[PDB]
Amino acid sequence: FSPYVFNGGTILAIAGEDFAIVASDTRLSEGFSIHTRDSPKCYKLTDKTVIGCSGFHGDCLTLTKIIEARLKMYKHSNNKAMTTGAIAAMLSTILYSRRFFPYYVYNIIGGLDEEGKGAVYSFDPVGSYQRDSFKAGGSASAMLQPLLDNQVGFKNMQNVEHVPLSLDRAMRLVKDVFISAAERDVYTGDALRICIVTKEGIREETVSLRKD
Amino acid sequence: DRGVNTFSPEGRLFQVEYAIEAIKLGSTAIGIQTSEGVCLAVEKRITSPLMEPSSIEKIVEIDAHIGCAMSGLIADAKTLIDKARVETQNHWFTYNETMTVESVTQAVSNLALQFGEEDADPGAMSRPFGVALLFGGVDEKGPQLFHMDPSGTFVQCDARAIGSASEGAQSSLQEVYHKSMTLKEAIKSSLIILKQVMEEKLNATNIELATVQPGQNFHMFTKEELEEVIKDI
Amino acid sequence: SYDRAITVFSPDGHLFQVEYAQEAVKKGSTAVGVRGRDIVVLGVEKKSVAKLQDERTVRKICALDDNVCMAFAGLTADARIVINRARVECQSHRLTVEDPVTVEYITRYIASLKQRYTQSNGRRPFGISALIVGFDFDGTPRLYQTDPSGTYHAWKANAIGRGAKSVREFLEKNYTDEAIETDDLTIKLVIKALLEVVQSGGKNIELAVMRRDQSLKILNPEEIEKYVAEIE
Amino acid sequence: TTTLAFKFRHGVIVAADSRATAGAYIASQTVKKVIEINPYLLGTMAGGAADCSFWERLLARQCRIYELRNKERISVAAASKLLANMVYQYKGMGLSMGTMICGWDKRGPGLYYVDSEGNRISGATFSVGSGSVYAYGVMDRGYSYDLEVEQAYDLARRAIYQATYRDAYSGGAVNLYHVREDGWIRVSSDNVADLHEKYS
Amino acid sequence: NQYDNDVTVWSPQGRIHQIEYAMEAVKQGSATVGLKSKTHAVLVALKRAQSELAAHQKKILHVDNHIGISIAGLTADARLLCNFMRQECLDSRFVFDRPLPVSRLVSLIGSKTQIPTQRYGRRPYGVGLLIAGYDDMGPHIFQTCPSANYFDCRAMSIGARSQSARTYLERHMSEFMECNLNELVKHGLRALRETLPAEQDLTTKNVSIGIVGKDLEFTIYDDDDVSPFLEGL
Amino acid sequence: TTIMAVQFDGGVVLGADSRTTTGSYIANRVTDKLTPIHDRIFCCRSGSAADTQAVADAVTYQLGFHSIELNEPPLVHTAASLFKEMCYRYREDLMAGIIIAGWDPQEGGQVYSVPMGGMMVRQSFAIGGSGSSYIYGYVDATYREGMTKEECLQFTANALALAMERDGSSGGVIRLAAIAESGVERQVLLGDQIPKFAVATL
Amino acid sequence: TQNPMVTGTSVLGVKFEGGVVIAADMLGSYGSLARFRNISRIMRVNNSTMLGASGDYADFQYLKQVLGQMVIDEELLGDGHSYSPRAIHSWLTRAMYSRRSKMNPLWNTMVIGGYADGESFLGYVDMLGVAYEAPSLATGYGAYLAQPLLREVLEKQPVLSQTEARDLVERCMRVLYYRDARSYNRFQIATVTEKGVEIEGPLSTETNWDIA
Amino acid sequence: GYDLSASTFSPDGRVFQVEYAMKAVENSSTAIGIRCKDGVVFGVEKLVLSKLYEEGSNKRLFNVDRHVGMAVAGLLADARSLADIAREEASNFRSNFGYNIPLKHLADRVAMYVHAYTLYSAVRPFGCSFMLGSYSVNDGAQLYMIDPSGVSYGYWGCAIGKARQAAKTEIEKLQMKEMTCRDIVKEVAKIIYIVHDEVKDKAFELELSWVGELTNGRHEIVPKDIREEAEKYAKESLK
């Protein structure tokens, strides 16, 4: 008996001066089979915070319900909603609590900070988190990260104007990077759930990718 | 005859009502909340010249933004102040944020009434805590002052006096408190009311004053700074 | 497990079991401690010499650690339990922090234990008060007192046990920078303080001194007699 | 990872890289491998990222409770023993943490190395990580207790740079901290790319 | 005499005086009103200030999006029950991913509050609660008692001078079902007022309002948010 | 081991080989695998001897207390359920294949197969053991609804004989039992009594 | 169970306009041997929910008793509330994950089909706590032989009638009999609708063609 | 002082704590139960203290199993506690033996838990008496009543509460053995109305439940229509 199974999934979060995009593929799988083609890996935690979880679907289901309860418990004792930074810290403690039987999940929390600016935090399967400007996680992370580093971080590029990222430019990047991942990753390519967090709430858009 | 958890015909719990009388025998402690911060003042009540006045600690720090004034059985408070300090550090480790003063007051007030002799626990408390606490701090809501009693009840107080002369300082407090009052005016008002209730002559060694201000951390006034305010008093 | 509440509040807010414990301390022998500049002195009244009793076995002054030592008034059996808990604590501290416990650290622990026995089911408060005296690493002479209630305060000089009020009144009027300048003057202050309560004089007075960076020294009966005569 | 620390006449110098790696994938080039327990005490992290960050943060929590209860800041030795005792409870279970506790106490500058294996050793110069071997050579050949502040800064930056050039799992920027009697100061965060141009 | 100090001693007339005593504690608390329409369940609480310089106390609490509670009696025991209720609701949404039926939660509280009334050394709970929740069975108002008995109420008032409120509610209960939220909230405010010391009025400082409905998660309106409801009486 | 049970209109017929084996050694050549859990409820045990003897002893104890408390003869389903409860609960620490067949006043003659793993299923006829595999096609080809106690006793004897001749772990004597409201009639077939089948010559 | 014993094969599911239909063979196999050939691996949890199970049959017999009591416990309260098809699916995911985390798994892949509030529910739960909802479900070898066919039809025509759903289930059952060596030609079809759950008796794919 | 604990017999052989506990049941409204040939009908006089109480509040007729129903008298909190015990005993019996628990076994097991609260000072005797009733094709209709002492007996018609004696006279004038549930429901309503004292007890809601061949061995609340016909017959009979 093996307690874990790779269910596939690619997650991406990009932060902006006034926005945070959390995006995911919508295809759960097992071996060479597809469980469903409509399993978004993005989960709204608050009105300013969305988490994206990929890996063992069993653990992602448990962890997401554990966070929803931990958020309600905070609001009941502290009489306030947890900030994006508070959930990032609590998730590190939740993930480490299971260091000897870890959660096979890769999580990216994307939301707006207490100053109203985008904030992305990436987590390892055991708890180590980081405030990043953009992070890709999941099956096609190494296929999406090397390009955000160039197009968003302007890395390895000389004599180029470092313009700020608009939601328009950021959303085309998210769609384009996932379209390329659908081409070379067998675990990604049903549709793309894109959750954009702004002071006006969390809007969710779904594009389509390549069914195999 | 009656165990610790027996209700009176008036439904009040005798052990909780005798612990309140225990506070009425404590050194008067005054707390005032202003926009510019919260001031906590207490009467040291020294017994002999051979005692070291510094050893009498009635105002303690739970965290950089939270201080506490105690009155009643001081030894009972030690365990309550320890819970407040650990709960604040646990909140930091888990959420990387300062705990609100209401959340610290709620965490300590929960330990009260958790007593009994019916095998409630291996290390269960036997009786209520005979102490009243005045928590003063600055959260995201601003300068805040809460009062907790041996009944497990906590309240937000703009100005509160606990101890032996509470039934007199509170009257004086309700006659000199204005929402617009400054921290300096509050600090002077605390010492004036304390000097009146205090049996000994208020000096820079027979009183303890501390203040939590929006930017500055919990600060226990030293003899030099206390002497300055006591000069005007 | 017997889990009845021995220590409970009374109408008027009085824990009588704690007050009864202090009555036992008042029935105890008088213990006096004066904190000097380079010497901390602790002296106890040897009630009855007994004549046929080894004194090494009835000593009321003990050393919790190399830097700390304590005297007690009240029940000798309860004290032995508290002294052993504090001795074990000092060693556990050296193991988890790699430094000698501070005088107030051990005073805080002894008080916290004496307090939990006043709010724990199935236990009676300890009928003993202690005078923890030592020297902090900085070299500051330290004198603290613990009560059966778990309350502890630092003092320049104090007295516990029978005739504590009389002895403390004396120390209140005889303590000064003058009667503390000389180590011998500090020792004779404790001697005179006890002689106010001790009737025999010299024969019935144990005394101990812990100078800085030095172990506890138990003054021999002859040395005590020397000061008793000089103090006459 | 490359973390080095040395005690000199003007305090204790702590430097480290910024790279985190999952397999051969460079996950991060901006990880902070120096934790500030207090304004006078800082701990560096090598080995398991989650392991070190969790235990070093639990150390900071315990150290602050000490200040509140003892009304004094903890020593570098008492803090080193606390982490050593905390990890020995999990010896032979998988924790991989190489750490250096550095601060200024009443006994002067302090530098202790603690491993999850159980090693707790005080010292003047330590280097922990996979590039520790590369850093020791440059640090050892250029070290001197009587090193001037600027020279000590340059020695630390150069030793981490040479460790990042020979070590695949070492890279990013060099984060320099200087512990003095009035607390620690973050001196600089120089990218190994810019350092490569200057040192060449 | 010897039948009124333990909860495990029946009186010669088949009565546990200790439960009767604990039930007196609730009658010694600020009046709290609760009524339900066809779509909304409103909880009106008369907050009481310990002093002119003290916040009232907070008598209305959140248990879950569909449930809220008004308190009367010992606040510490109320917090202990509120936590049991909050966890039972969290457990239901974690296992069945569904809001816990309000009726089922009341059954659990009565089971937890009955155990302490039949065991030696244990005291009855000294808190009376008015629970307001919405479910697939519509709006629900329940009243829990220290005796462990609970009642499904169309409207209820627990606390001091609460009979004055129950008189108003019994007279106007017929029109509550078909009532708008503001008409319903004002009916409750009128009844809470009938429990006020003659020369006293319902200011925004002494009143709190909790509401839950088909499209409204339990909300506690306090301070200025009560001004909309108070304006119109 | 070959255990077999069949139901007829009025009761049930049970059968078993008599061979216990440690490797290829026959520790017991006359074992009784047909154990009585109650007056009209018997069990046919297969698998581990210690495991099957312990569970049958436990169920007889529990079933006995239940019958004296509920003043009524026990139901065959209750015995099967108690066997299922233990065999499922200790499925990882117990090798025990059991057939619980008996007569009850309410549901008549009932044959229940509680196989390895803890599963329980009512069956018209049940077979179990290492020799069960060699007689699956026979029982499927020779079983007919409406058989009698005499026909059912012959079916069990003929089937067990074929399995005992092909399974090395099966053999010895054929122990038969017929349970009905009247009582429990037990019979041992030995030597020429055991049904025989002619071998080939080529 | 660390070692499955008597097991069942594939269970099919498809949501139609007005409810859902589940299909399973009436066979329990002991490692290649068709040992028990008249067992139902389908269950009526309540009037709105049905459950089909693959894997260890004793583990399914344990779930039938625990879920059966859970429903009797609720229907004794007379509160007017009942477990919905989705609530039963949430409980089963929590149960399978709880057991997998204790390393004592219930070797069973269940298909939960339900109808409530004019909405059809079809949920999948594996032994590791992986669960999802989908228009069609096929456990075991039906994941490779039946789901492909069901997914093709449910792609062109997203909404199927009861007549269409049953036809496609009976067609997928025939292909499972031709290519699954642990299958059997006797099967039960359960249908949940506004009238409740109805289970059809021993049906046969006897409509098999053998042009060899 | 011989009457302060259930661990103490009086100098006469009596445990007065259990007698005091049953005084509480005699201070409650009456709950009558009548067994016929078709099954069992339970009826309770639920006095409504406050008009601000929804209909069905403080119900005294419970479903302890699919086939078993429980009528209660005395403290409702204690009664609700024993309904949980009865519900759990029935559940564990079905999980261990795999069938619906016989009412005699359910009665015996619940009566033993009640008797366990009459022997120690650490606990007080339950202040409630209840009637358990069921109907199966094999066992038929069964009515059992349990008292605060823990004594269980089967009856053809039982009455617990403040008017048990008067109710028993009325129940004893009935030929339940020959009557059917449909006819008994009206008689239960007639007796509850005749035993009710409006002058003292203000108003009450007649609560009616039954289990029988008509309910197919399932405890249920008498259909509103049948309950209303019964109440009309009851009031008309009182005339």
Add this chain to the structure above:
Amino acid sequence: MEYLIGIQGPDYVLVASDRVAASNIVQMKDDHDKMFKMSEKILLLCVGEAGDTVQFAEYIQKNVQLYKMRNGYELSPTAAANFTRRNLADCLRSRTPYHVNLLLAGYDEHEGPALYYMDYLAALAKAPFAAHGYGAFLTLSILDRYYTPTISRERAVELLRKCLEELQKRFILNLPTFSVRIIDKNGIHDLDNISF
């Protein structure tokens, strides 16, 4: 590995320990001390797994120090050796065993000098001279060839030097400095470190 040596003389006990702490292929310390002062006349030289040596050695030290405080007198070298052996032997079949090889050395004013060898299995043996470590294989024969029961403390340091010079020539591990201490009626005395 690490090196421990003890030579018992007529009125003294000479002990030496290596001063190097190594991570893997790098010495992280060349001033390490592997000797612990249990009493004023008892020393415990401990080598072994990282974390196990100080956890066991500091434990034995605080318990021997508690004895002096609780009884006013100190444990004898033999009582201390036996207390250590019981604790090492009572954690052997436990889930938390200590991998530690030790050398207790002390001077009782009555029984005189004593050196006790203990292995990780907790076997206690009193020895005139003993060593722990892979270097013991190259030095125990030098001690056997030259040790005489009446050796002087001066000739004892010379033999200690012969053994450490052998380690410099034949041993494959760079053990450059050695901590050298002696115990007698006047207590524990630190001697100059024999460095190479």
